[PDB]
DNA sequence: CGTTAGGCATTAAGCTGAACGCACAAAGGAACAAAATAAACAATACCACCGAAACAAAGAATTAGAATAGTATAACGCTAACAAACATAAATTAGATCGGAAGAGCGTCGTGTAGGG
DNA sequence: CCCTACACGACGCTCTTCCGATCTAATTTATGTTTGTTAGCGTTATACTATTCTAATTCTTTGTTTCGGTGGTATTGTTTATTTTGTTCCTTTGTGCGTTCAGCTTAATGCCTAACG
């Protein structure tokens, strides 16, 4: 089949190759076999907190869609701040 | 007949990675990541390529600075791997739970 | 899978056949290049060289509505 | 004359005997509940300030503040606060 | 001349938090040039509610160890005890509070 | 002989009652002396009140608490019970000041 | 007022650090804890003491109030309460 | 008509070639260094409105910002500040 | 009627920043009513030196690596190498700027 | 000595034409990725043993509350005065819109390097 | 000791992108009031430190004792280096719909006077 199993795993769309990177970008020499679906949680909990922040941004000011600096304020909000878009 | 000891080509590894600068992970696994992941607010919502690039530069960067964090956890927990012990080590010594 | 595709416009008319011609002239050359080169080459062409593909993306469009009416286009996830 | 240093301290007496009407309050924690409204107030009037300035709007409305609680606020303690800011200006605009 | 009774807006809202107060308080602290007229009522309405949770939460640490005065240990058990508002208060430290009781599970003796 | 008991109850025991308690730990006068001598570093001449020093105690004790409440975190990981200056090292390095 | 204040960085104890670390649920104990703890404290101190340092010399006093120490600890993410 | 977006991105260039007659930059770091502008200039001002918040003035001045600046900016870097600071006032009020 | 020649600020204080600019967005930047008239002139001066020094240290970072184009990595290892300005920079992250070399002293072979 | 009732500049609230963003069609390989095998080494189970730290009496500065002397210093009330706010051009200038040029990607050679018998 | 699979300089093509020139709204900056915050000076009262008295208290000191840290030896199992197939993902212009924006009209609205707890 096109996908293996049920699939439904979006969040398994960053697969262990793409951890390995940013694991490997992180200095760690060796990576045990439980660390991909903790770090997936992580993906989860971050995303979930920034998004939140964004979209109640983009939806007091009456638009449908997600601006970047929206996103930068929404990193502001936590701390979190990056640059190269304006601010 | 040339098998490699494990962990010259992994310091080989790091020293690409560090030199590299470029995206870690590919843009469309994120993409519908982020598009699975926003629904659940509100329905209708797109974005701007800038506004997911800038989503995925974030967590990119929010997870080197994990894992680093938790890659000196481990030495100093006198191992030369990764463990969830270090994952859940580090979620509270920095304080987000 | 059920999927109505779009209709290919007059650069798609001339894009294929091109491509077609690239791949049998020129093989072993990676097809992203190809299809930079063939971008390139679309935007030096004068407007009055690309009439007959123009007028084909249209007749293609006609075919399309008489075929697909229902294609108001609605995509979804 | 002299200088006048306010609080809120009546109206923490009078929250406290509205909820409790038996208990009373040291002006330790008298002082802990004034730090703690002014606070909150700084950081939601604070907010509702970005708010406006990166809308283009030179004011702060309902909505702006509602923006701002729906924000800080995490959880249930927000919508609990949405239900009833919409109940009390329903009240205020009634009059 | 003669005016009309004069009728507080925290008698117009059911309120005990006062409305002129936190509408000075907006106007001179300088957060936009005009204020609108529900946003102090919906200031006064959601700081009244957290302080009355507060109070609703800590009256009963502080009944629940049999005195009737609140004490800032009976505040830290109470903003530390319940999650829900304790993400809000995480970099907030009670002065005389303490450290709410705990104890690791692997340091009781065999 | 007088009877002892094994090391660690006595610990347990006021482990209990000191963070059951809410007084300040501290001494207040080798504290202020403290705070005196190292204030005297940036404008000299400097007084304080009972409440700046009484705040400055209950900072220092919070940062300090939760210093250590990491730091146990920090060595309990490494399978054991005692603190060590690589503990304090590590804590202060997952923070982000060292 | 005829003094200069030197040579209580001591002046807090060994027990006193041992008593902290029972309030941080703390067991054992080494001996070389107290020198690092109070040089963490000694830093810590140092940067909110310059804080109001500079806080006072701004407002045109000669003295440190408790208000201005609750600025430092709310401009270093520390806020605290119960000093207004 | 249009929505016209500016930055301070010339100014950056002549800065650029002001220390560095020879380099060239990118459009992204250009981008990155207005962030980096506006950032901090965000950071100053609010520190110096806190400031005069407290000190019960209604205005801001240039020991306002000094303070400001010596409060954000740790160690040398702030002495180097406060020193070309005062050079840049006594030029401005020199004429 | 006859005005005199237009001096700006900037040119009055041997400046390249603009002085009306950040004088009006003081003004409608909500900080307070007045303006002092020095204080965007000490703001114009500390931003240049801001990010003069930025343009130091990140020029001879890409000199150093042979490139006259200043590349957002050159920035990542200016203010991550320098520990003077890092502790300003600690929780802002440089987008496309990766992270700076670093490898543990015991994950070399033996 | 603090809070509330009336009168208009000024600001958003709809509202419609118009510019902008983004998905998505064919065509291909190709970089990528999932799975399977030695292997090896690193985590781990556990033992000796040891010295470094808990328990605890005996004294030892020392805080701990209280006056109190005084005393530099927040914390006032009028000024006035200097500095900013509010009109009013003009003129620089910052930014939008087209042109070239060189600076860096692609790669490819050979070179040096530093890892499995 | 052995040789030998992957990172770097010289150089040429290549394309792209960023430096240079030019026109034009706009907004920055000299005048000239008004007005209104705040240095500055007299005052004052006030809260903070120095000093000294009981006292109590808790820090040190000198031991016992005991148990966790550390080094060491099996051990085993679990991840890696590597191949071997799956597999998904890069690029381009034109088309269509959805959304946002900006000018425009118009209705709310809160800055600024005058009286009750």
């Known amino acids: 089949k096109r996908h293996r199993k049920v699939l439904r795993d979006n969040i398994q769309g960053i697969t262990k190759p793409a951890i390995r990177r940013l694991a490997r970008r992180g200095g760690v020499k060796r990576i045990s076999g439980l660390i991909y679906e903790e770090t997936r949680g992580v993906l989860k909990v971050f995303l979930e907190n920034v998004i939140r922040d964004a979209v109640t941004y983009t939806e007091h000011a009456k638009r449908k869609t997600v601006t970047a600096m929206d996103v930068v304020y929404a990193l502001k909000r936590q701390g979190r701040t990056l640059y190269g878009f304006g601010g | 007949p040339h098998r490699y000891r494990p962990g010259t080509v992994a310091l080989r590894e790091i020293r690409r990675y560090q030199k590299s600068t470029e995206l870690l992970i590919r843009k469309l696994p994120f993409q519908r990541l982020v598009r699975e992941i926003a629904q659940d607010f509100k329905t209708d919502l797109r974005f701007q390529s800038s506004a997911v690039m800038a989503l995925q530069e974030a967590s990119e960067a929010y997870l080197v600075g994990l894992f680093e964090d938790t890659n000196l956890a481990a030495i100093h927990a006198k191992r030369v791997t990764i463990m969830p012990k270090d994952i859940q080590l580090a979620r509270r010594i920095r304080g987000e739970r | 899978s059920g999927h109505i595709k779009r209709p290919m416009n007059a650069f798609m008319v001339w894009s294929k056949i091109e491509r077609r011609k690239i791949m049998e002239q020129s093989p072993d050359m990676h097809n992203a290049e190809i299809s930079k080169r063939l971008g390139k080459r679309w935007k030096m062409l004068k407007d009055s060289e690309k009439i007959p593909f123009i007028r084909e993306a249209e007749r293609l469009r006609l075919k399309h509505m008489a075929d697909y009416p229902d294609y108001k286009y609605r995509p979804r996830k | ?95 | 001349k003669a005016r009309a009774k004069a009728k507080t807006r925290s008698s117009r809202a059911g309120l005990q938090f006062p409305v002129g107060r936190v509408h000075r308080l907006l106007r001179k602290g300088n957060y936009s040039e005009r204020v609108g007229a529900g946003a102090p009522v919906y200031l006064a309405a959601v700081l009244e509610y957290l302080t009355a949770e507060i109070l609703e939460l800590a009256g009963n640490a502080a009944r629940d160890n049999k005195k009737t005065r609140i004490i800032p240990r009976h505040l830290q058990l109470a903003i530390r005890n319940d999650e829900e508002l304790n993400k809000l208060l995480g970099r907030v430290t009670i002065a005389q509070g303490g450290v709410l009781p705990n104890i690791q599970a692997v340091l009781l003796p065999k």
């Open chain 4, 1 to 95: 004359k002299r200088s006048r240093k306010e609080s809120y301290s009546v109206y923490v007496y009078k929250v406290l005997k509205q909820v409790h009407p038996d208990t009373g309050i040291s002006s330790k924690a008298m002082g802990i509940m004034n730090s703690f409204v002014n606070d909150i107030f700084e950081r939601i009037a604070g907010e509702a300030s970005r708010l406006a300035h990166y809308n283009k709007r030179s004011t702060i409305t309902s909505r702006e503040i509602q923006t701002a609680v729906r924000l800080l606020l995490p959880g249930e303690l927000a919508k609990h606060a949405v239900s009833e800011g919409t109940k009390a200006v329903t009240k205020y605009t009634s009059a």
